[PDB]
Symmetry: D2
Subunit: 314 residues, 4 copies
């Protein structure tokens, strides 16, 4: 084959934004859009097409699951949101059944590329996507704590007047309320962030609120304009370029665990090296006492829910 | 001042997409969002911020009209859509009153940058923005037939298997039903498009439908997914870079007329040279008999509606 | 391949070293092999060029031999000695034909199955030779041809009109060299005839024939100032290389295989052509007015006799 | 200014010509003046570099004199003669101090009010001199300093770990040259200590001291192969130039004015620093372990005596 083919599954606000971000960046020459309502996925290809007159060329079209036979990359944003009076366990059970109905026909098409999974809850569903496909663990890449890392970075940028790209600051654990900022491993210019904190008169106090503001930014953005999508759309575009450009770039992702942090048989938020084979390397960072306790607490929790969910899905 | 400041006015789907497209492209270091509902324009700055961790740095914030004092660029997407049982004349009268309420406070702030006007109907409202501001005509740039040119280009690309960027094909006239494709001036590689048409067995017949499909793509996209925004968002980003990078780039825009096509005292769709001063040069293209008749018909029509509208607005 | 893309450069002179650096800046091709005779120089260059990768996109840059071509997507041939003072164009031709034979045989022996881009001068003779000697289909030998001088014409018409050179759609056509011409009648700015732009701007017939002549002399004029010319063609090579590796189907002026276009066949010559992952997708046959019809015929007949005598002599 | 940005290059040697080409590829700065002694070469170069603009972003590239600096945002000084065989470092110092005096006086006389970026070797002595001789605040003289060798260290640690060199946060620090060191204790990959990466990867203390030494020798090793080194620093200059013109507040290793950081004052020296439209925004004072504390002190004391004797001699 002559050029690179991404398949997006799920053309909601997250998925649409991803497709547009890949249109602006001129990444992937062919872009397949797969969802249930074919009239919408068509309208979206027609709308997204119009950008290719000012960006790089791209053949964007609406498709079905079979398009994956010759895909390099399947991006799964497929899932229903949290309806009021739906608990997290019902959201989990509803979304596992959605992801089973996406993975099985992708794998039946003879797709042998890389998965990036972005559907919430993302570390449960990255686990599920690997279980259901049979794919090697490194060829299922989780979006995981990429976005919330990006959020910690943008917040620490504004507080220090540093380009967000040079804040090496990681949100780690299960994407969601049990995640934490790995502040003791975090640096700007090689200099510890907890040293920058002490010279800038930024207390332990403020850093725990900065951390808690990252966890609540989804809520705060949903509560203002109804949804959140540009952040993750961009995080997804960035992991997409590490894979397709074979970069060996260092990104916080939902990465398969094989002993790192004392964890196994689990996807969870850590810095990883990302390339054409997916997760190349987990980077196992030094955790202080609080971070170590949040990673253990976050992981054990995530494991029970992801295994009962697969057991109940069957 | 040390860096470039864009102000978007109007943070609907068109405006939001524009802001994201400028975030991906790393164009403008400071990006002000002005609309009525401050909780939405805030939510959008918070959402758009998150991209700057993977793209170039950008200080995006919600503001009011006063932010324009030190703006290089004001992008006006402000306007209400066409409600069913609203005629075009009521849409015109409603949108003129909206644009008067945007222009007056921008000009009161002491803004002395460039306008790009994208609110529909765009050639009436580019006219209005120039009348209301008192600004020299070249410092009011219309979005005009940029999008629909982009659409003709993408359609002729697919039909010939040519990168849409190398189809030099212009939609001209008033953006809307009275516009036409300047096919006799259109070329690929220097070679006339009507010669490519005759070798490719593409009839006069097919080209008039290709033209009519460009005019109906808004409708067709609205009818599939409820709205159209990625095309114009990208067209707006592209004209935005010609201004801010002082490019002297050739783009189809709503350009001020001073004798070109036998027209005066009018903004209308033509290729123009775009730079840091706005419209540098109108490019007056050869029209065949049909194109000349569509440009005259489109322009006279647009003039009566734009002058009654300003007369009624007062 | 496709998901980790490999360019091989053959010839790490000024043109080739500039090419590698332009491909370093643009972040195009994940792997970049340099093949030249003196390995201590091709190594020193890969060491200097990798220093860029800390600020540009990642790239595996290294000195190699001809065997590296087995898994290459794209082989860029800049190799050949330039014109010595008492050397005739015929001896430059005969010398560089024997050099390109000595590059092509080991490329083919490596099992290389990707695309050639030929930049060695004289470029339309040597693109002919690369095709005859490789056995590769005509579409997978792309000649740099009139890309650079097209770039020169566009930049000169851009300074004259204060237009972005990327929107000045003017081609230099024919054999790259003294016989080439500006296709001014087919040339356009936003779809406007350039001859009409010329008449409104007070640019006469004779100023355009000088602009055309000044393009053919720019190499000499630059060589006489700073000893050599390379940034132009380095860029043109990078641009054709991006159309191939990104499968763009972009319209570029190139040395394009002829099959009836301009009444020509069994020749590579300067025309706008659609370029993608398979090399030359589509030759654009542009309309020629009476002067440039006669310049294309004159340029092509000439280039044919020299390419056929040269290959007859080589073989 | 801001909306049409002007860089002036002073010195169109190999380093400066590469810089201009990298700035051509990246589409940074709308106007680019080249100021050197031999005007026929600075013209030939502007003619060759403009040929790029047909495929890259538009740019007004031209040969100028020192007066062009009046409306410049950024003046890049690469100017100075390299080390002649029987020349001591003191005579190289004394020769290049008198050259930089002869560049700085007419820049200042033009009414130039933008930022200096100083790349001429020895770079931390000559950044000191550019500040003393210009009268400009310390923040508006940015030294290229340890940017290139930082780039070298990162590319070498990237090949060893198969990590994108852009994610290897390792700095070379001190005086650019033989006294400089790799700040390995403060160095990190995704927030992981590099010394921990070293111990898991079986990379010993002695291999890291060789990697450090191999960075200090890379210039020599490249010069011995291909006569000169330029693509590295050309790139480093382009990167610092983008942080200034885009007001990025990006963290880069540079020759940064000292005001108490490392117990140093009244010196330019290699440290990571935040760089924006006002030049040096913020020096990052990184933690030094016992070896690199003693390398920074040793490097800085040395550089101080030579910069003060040299300016005493010049003045």
């Amino acid at each position: 084959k002559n050029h690179q083919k991404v398949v997006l599954v799920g053309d909601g606000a997250v998925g649409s934004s991803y497709a547009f971000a890949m249109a602006q960046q001129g990444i992937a020459e062919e872009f397949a859009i797969v969802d249930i309502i074919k009239e919408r996925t068509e309208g979206d290809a027609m709308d997204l097409e119009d950008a290719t007159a000012f960006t790089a060329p791209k053949n964007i079209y609406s498709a079905d699951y079979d398009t994956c036979k010759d895909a390099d990359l399947v991006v799964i944003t497929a899932g229903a949101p949290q309806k009021p009076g739906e608990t997290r366990l019902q959201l989990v059970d509803k979304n596992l059944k959605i992801i089973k109905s996406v993975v099985e026909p992708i794998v039946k098409s003879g797709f042998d590329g890389i998965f990036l999974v972005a559907a919430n809850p993302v570390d449960i569903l990255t686990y599920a996507v690997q279980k259901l496909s049979g794919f090697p663990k490194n060829k299922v890449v989780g979006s995981g704590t990429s976005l919330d890392s990006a959020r910690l970075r943008v917040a620490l940028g504004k507080k220090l007047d540093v380009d967000p790209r040079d804040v090496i600051a990681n949100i780690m654990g299960e994407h969601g309320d049990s995640e934490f900022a790995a502040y003791s491993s975090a640096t700007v210019g090689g200099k510890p962030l907890l040293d920058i904190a002490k010279d800038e008169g930024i207390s332990e106090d403020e850093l725990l609120k900065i951390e808690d503001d990252v966890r609540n930014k989804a809520y705060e953005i949903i509560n203002r304009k109804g949804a959140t999508f540009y952040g993750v759309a961009t995080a997804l575009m960035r992991i997409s370029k590490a894979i397709l450009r074979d970069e060996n770039s260092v990104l916080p992702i939902g990465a398969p665990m094989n002993g790192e942090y004392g964890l196994n048989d689990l996807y969870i938020g850590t810095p990883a090296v990302v390339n054409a084979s997916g997760v190349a390397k987990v980077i196992e960072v030094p955790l202080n006492d609080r971070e170590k306790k949040a990673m253990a607490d976050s992981a054990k929790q995530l494991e029970e829910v992801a295994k009962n969910g697969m057991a109940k899905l069957q």
